[PDB]
């Protein structure tokens, strides 16, 4: 329930989901000791959720509904790589192959909507199609494309310059020089332009806080608002927990 | 001119001359004249005397180079370990040979320069080129194939650079002033100075 060794301390007040009267979901938030890192030009949609040890490089775009959970292990998304709508990127604690279980995404990688990536190595200039599942330990080498509705089984490899399709994904054709050189990069650049557009009409603190401030001001006016020194309470709770842990016999 | 019809530039009459006019009414000089020691060292009349006056520079440079190398060796030798060999017996040949070979090269250079100037009877670029060529030839006696060509060329080129930028350059631009009126053009209406600017005193360090 309460993690007393949490980096910022125990939680003085925890509120239940039933008691919430508005949506408080944060697009970037810290899971215990793991902190997501982002560049200046990284676009995270309001719907999107990014938590854990996720490192977002420059020109990374996280579109609406995408969930990038970096709780079990590290996720790295390379430069100008776009995670499109409702696409989940997650990392496993360990990989079946025995290699590193981090989810590393290279540069100019487009993950199409509803595609699931878990503990995979995605090389530079790659496209993962819509509803394509890349399982743990699967490695896509650079300049390779996975067609929509295809599954890369755990510990499998897609060679460079190749298009792969099917539920047991198989070789279809060799990607042409024009494709690998231009179009794969161009798709990521297009989605960067779209995300740049979305960033340009975003206010730093959009006027949704006013509604909650109205409730807080009403509580202040009726004298129910309470001022709590959370820092001191965290210190006191940790002290009490240590004393109790010393006292216990079993 | 800035047109395609008549030649650019201009011409000055050779018959017509313009009377010199002083850059300023009173001239104050902060540049000191050459010392008697400089004229003594520059004198190439007696080639032996000229050589012996100018070699201390070469011997000094060879001594610094040998000292640099000898210290690089000395720094490496371990004080904690007692050494069977004598360090100075190892290090003295370095410094002595560097100094001797530097002095020999400088001696060839100065002697050939003075001998050529005496025989030619004129001060010219060619004396420096020939002295440098001889010095570079002595540098590359037993050296592999590119070096018989490159060292005479480099050692000859060095006095050309020294003559071009040490003697010709200063003498070419003595007249140019930078204040008052341009040296060629005094007819133009520019502020005329009573006295030349003194930006610094004669140095004494």
């Amino acid at each position: 329930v309460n993690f007393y060794d949490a980096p910022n301390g125990p939680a003085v007040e925890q509120v239940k989901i039933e008691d919430e009267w508005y949506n408080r979901q944060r697009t970037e938030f810290n899971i215990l000791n793991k902190q997501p890192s982002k560049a200046d030009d990284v676009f995270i949609a309001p719907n999107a959720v990014v938590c854990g040890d996720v490192d977002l490089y420059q020109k990374v775009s996280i579109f609406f509904g995408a969930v990038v959970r970096g709780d079990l292990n590290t996720i790295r998304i390379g430069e100008n790589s776009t995670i499109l709508d409702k696409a989940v990127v997650h990392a496993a604690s360990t990989s079946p192959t025995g290699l590193n279980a981090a989810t590393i995404i290279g540069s100019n990688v487009t993950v199409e909507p509803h595609a699931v990536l878990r503990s995979c190595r995605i090389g530079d200039n790659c496209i993962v199609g819509a509803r394509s599942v890349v399982c743990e330990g699967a490695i896509m080498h650079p300049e390779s494309v996975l067609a929509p509705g295809s599954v890369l089984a755990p510990g499998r490899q897609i060679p460079s310059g190749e298009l792969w399709a099917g539920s047991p994904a198989k070789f279809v054709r060799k990607l042409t020089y024009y494709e690998t050189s231009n179009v794969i990069r161009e798709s990521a650049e297009h989605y960067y332009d779209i995300a740049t557009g979305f960033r340009n009409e975003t206010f730093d603190h959009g006027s949704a806080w006013r509604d909650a401030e109205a409730y807080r001001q009403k509580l202040v006016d009726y004298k129910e608002y309470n001022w709590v020194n959370y820092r001191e309470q965290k210190y006191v709770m940790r002290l009490q927990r240590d004393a109790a842990e010393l006292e216990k016999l079993l | 001119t800035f047109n395609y019809v008549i030649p650019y530039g201009g011409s000055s009459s050779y018959t017509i001359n313009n009377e010199p006019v002083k850059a300023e009414e009173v001239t104050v000089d902060f540049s000191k004249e050459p010392s008697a020691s400089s004229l003594k060292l520059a004198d190439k009349s007696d080639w032996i005397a000229y050589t012996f006056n100018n070699v201390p520079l070469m011997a000094t440079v060879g001594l610094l180079a040998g000292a640099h190398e000898a210290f690089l060796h000395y720094e490496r030798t371990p004080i904690y370990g007692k050494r069977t060999y004598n360090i100075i017996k190892k290090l003295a040949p370095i410094v002595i040979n560097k100094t001797a070979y530097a002095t020999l090269l400088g001696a060839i250079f100065c002697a050939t320069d003075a001998l050529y100037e005496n025989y030619s009877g004129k001060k010219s670029y060619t004396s420096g080129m020939v002295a440098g060529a001889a010095t570079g030839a002595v540098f590359a006696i037993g050296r592999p194939l590119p070096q018989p060509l490159v060292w005479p060329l480099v050692f000859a080129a060095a006095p050309v650079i020294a003559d071009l930028f040490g003697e010709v350059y200063p003498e070419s631009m003595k007249s140019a002033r930078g204040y008052g009126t341009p040296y060629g053009f005094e007819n133009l209406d520019d502020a005329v100075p009573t006295r030349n600017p003194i930006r610094r005193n004669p140095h004494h360090y």
Partner: protein, 308 residues
């Protein structure tokens, strides 16, 4: 803590206490003027911006959200609750079905859990998961993980009497982006990421449904078998160690849900205070600062603990 003279702005960063000095009162009044002028300028800009004006509002909490109660079809999984009287004289609904969850359950704020949904203890509904029990009940057992962007759907039983409720057993893992319509899942089953389980499908205990596999309707996946494919077909039997993996995945996601529930459940004032804790942790990383000579600071909350 060691000191009690900390500035009130430092102790209450979320909201500074009522101004007491004259200068503070003047600053408060000037802030009021600035706030009103800024709102006026905001509305003037919104006029030029066109239809919508780029207005923003707080969103409803859909993790614990009701559905219309049917007098004919009584609730099966969720509880039924009355609604406020004023909403009664506006909307006219007498009662509304609400989801039923245990205290240990973690539901993400993003997730939409609606109506006839019963969720057991230590189960987790993750981000983007939509659980609609509007027409029929949804039951989820203990230590069951509905992962990100999973859609669980139900239908009406109809004349045949075919059961169109969704019953998910204990220790069941539903992979990310999987779609589960009115099917039955037994205990200790992994549903792969992207897998589609249609109507009438009974998946027996100990089985694994592969990633991106569509199991055809009215298909029984027997116990201890792995089924993959667009027309999902049997490939191999579950290895004895893979069973221990199934349990390990369930338990690992239980711990994960506890952590995520702990992070999300903090109130705003505590979150802002924790942001300041992280910030002055970063500022205090330099150990040659003058204040470090003065005191040793508590690690979790950078407050002076003891003098140095």
């Amino acid at each position: 803590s060691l000191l009690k003279n900390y500035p009130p702005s430092y102790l209450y960063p979320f909201r500074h206490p009522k101004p007491e000095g004259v200068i503070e009162k003047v600053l408060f009044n000037l802030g009021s003027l600035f706030r009103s002028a800024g709102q006026g300028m905001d509305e003037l800009g919104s006029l030029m911006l066109g239809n919508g004006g780029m207005q923003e509002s707080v969103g409803p909490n859909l993790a614990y959200a009701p559905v219309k109660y049917n007098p004919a079809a009584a609730p099966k999984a969720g509880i039924v609750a009355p609604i406020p009287a004023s909403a009664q004289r506006v909307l006219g609904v007498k009662e509304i079905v609400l989801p039923s969850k245990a205290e240990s359950t973690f539901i993400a704020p993003n997730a939409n859990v609606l109506g006839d949904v019963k969720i057991g203890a230590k189960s987790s509904i993750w981000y983007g998961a939509v659980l609609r029990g509007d027409v029929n009940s949804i039951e989820i057992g203990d230590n069951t993980n509905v992962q990100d962007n999973v859609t669980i759907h139900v239908a009406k039983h109809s004349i045949d009497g075919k059961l169109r409720n969704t019953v998910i057993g204990n220790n069941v893992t539903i992979g990310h982006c999987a779609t589960i319509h009115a099917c039955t899942i037994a205990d200790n089953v992994i549903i792969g990421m992207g897998a589609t389980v249609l109507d009438g499908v009974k998946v027996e205990s100990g089985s694994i449904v592969g990633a991106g596999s569509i199991v055809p309707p009215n298909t029984v996946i027997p116990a201890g078998q792995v089924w993959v494919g667009n027309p999902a077909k049997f490939i191999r039997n579950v290895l004895p160690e893979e069973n221990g993996f199934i349990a390990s995945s369930a338990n690992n996601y239980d711990l994960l849900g506890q952590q995520h529930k702990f992070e999300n459940s903090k109130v705003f004032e505590e979150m802002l205070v924790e942001e300041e804790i992280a910030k002055d942790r970063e500022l205090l990383e330099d150990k040659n600062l003058a204040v470090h000579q003065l005191y040793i600071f508590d690690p979790q909350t950078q407050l002076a603990a003891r003098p140095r």
